[PDB]
Amino acid sequence: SPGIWQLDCTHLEGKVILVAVHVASGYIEAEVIPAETGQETAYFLLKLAGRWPVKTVHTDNGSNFTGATVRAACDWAGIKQEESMNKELKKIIGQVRDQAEHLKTAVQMAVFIHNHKRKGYSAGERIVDIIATDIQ
Amino acid sequence: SPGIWQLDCTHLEGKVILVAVHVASGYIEAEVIPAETGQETAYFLLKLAGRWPVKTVHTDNGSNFTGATVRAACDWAGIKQESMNKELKKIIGQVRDQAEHLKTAVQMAVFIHNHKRGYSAGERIVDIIATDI
Numbered sequence: 001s002p003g004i005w006q007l008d009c010t011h012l013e014g015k016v017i018l019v020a021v022h023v024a025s026g027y028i029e030a031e032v033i034p035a036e037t038g039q040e041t042a043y044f045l046l047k048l049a050g051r052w053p054v055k056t057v058h059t060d061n062g063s064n065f066t067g068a069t070v071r072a073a074c075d076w077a078g079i080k081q082e083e084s085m086n087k088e089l090k091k092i093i094g095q096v097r098d099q100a101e102h103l104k105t106a107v108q109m110a111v112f113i114h115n116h117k118r119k120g121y122s123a124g125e126r127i128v129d130i131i132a133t134d135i136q
Numbered sequence: 137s138p139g140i141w142q143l144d145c146t147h148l149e150g151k152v153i154l155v156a157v158h159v160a161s162g163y164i165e166a167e168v169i170p171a172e173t174g175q176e177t178a179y180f181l182l183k184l185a186g187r188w189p190v191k192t193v194h195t196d197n198g199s200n201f202t203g204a205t206v207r208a209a210c211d212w213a214g215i216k217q218e219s220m221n222k223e224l225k226k227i228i229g230q231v232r233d234q235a236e237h238l239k240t241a242v243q244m245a246v247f248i249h250n251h252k253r254g255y256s257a258g259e260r261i262v263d264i265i266a267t268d269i
């Protein structure tokens with residue numbers, strides 16, 4: 001389904017990365033966040049939902065999903081709750097880590113490479129095709 | 137034209153907001169940044185280009201575009217530098233009180249702008265890009 005995303009966390013270098021995958025396409029949005037808290041998780045969900053039509057997010061249901069602020073953000077945005085990438089994404093982060101001072105910039109180089117890679121169609125072309133198909 | 141974006145800056149509450157508009161659809165990505173510098177601008181362009189197929193960005197050509205780091209980010213990403221805004225500050229206005237931080241109001245405003253509807257800016261951008269594919 002076009003509105004279904006999976007959010008997972010991954011840790012690198014003492015920092016927390018949130019990785020959202022659009023399940024049907026393999027497109028990703030990812031960010032380094034200062035801490036895995038309710039407030040940061042809510043803000044990430046708000047940003048994601050402002051950019052793509054997010055109906056359902058599959059999460060690990062952990063501690064940063066149980067609070068008032070996340071619940072409020074999901075409610076406000078119209079979002080409901082209901083494997084390879086974390087490792088591949090880390091592999092690309094690995095490949096590019098030295099070219100940037102900051103982990104955040106390496107992570108965004110990795111999002112770029114992941115979504116443009118053509119192995120065919122890229123994940124970028126796949127997401128837009130599946131959503132344009134749904135609108136029509 | 138599907139790969140053409142316009143980036144501008146706007147200032148509110150002592151902070152700097154970067155607003156990228158996909159010119160053919162009116163779809164926006166926007167962020168609050170800690171300063172209008174070469175490094176923050178290059179990182180914003182890198183994020184944008186990893187999410188949407190950005191071929192050309194129209195900028196104001198100011199100081200934060202003249203440096204080594206922006207030039208490098210645009211080169212690396214394949215970007216060249218050859219209405220949907222005033223509304224934004226007005227939506228930020230409407231939602232400002234519901235968020236402690238300006239950043240969260242700006243992202244409420246991006247959501248509202250892109251979802252408002254016979255098509256939203258979100259539907260228009262995906263229609264335009266799917267067609268070009």
Ligand SMILES: OC[C@@H]1COc2ccccc2C1
Pocket residue numbers: 039042043046069072073076234235240244
């Ligand atoms: O009422 C929830 C709104 C919209 O989403 C967020 C996200 C993070 C922090 C605050 C809020 C307020």
Ligand SMILES: OC[C@@H]1COc2ccccc2C1
Pocket residue numbers: 099100105109175178179182205208209210212
């Ligand atoms: O060498 C350019 C790359 C890709 O983009 C950015 C953006 C900000 C800072 C460094 C870099 C490295």
Ligand SMILES: [Cl-]
Pocket residue numbers: 007008009036060062064
């Ligand atoms: Cl998480």
Ligand SMILES: [Cl-]
Pocket residue numbers: 143144145172196198200
């Ligand atoms: Cl600017």
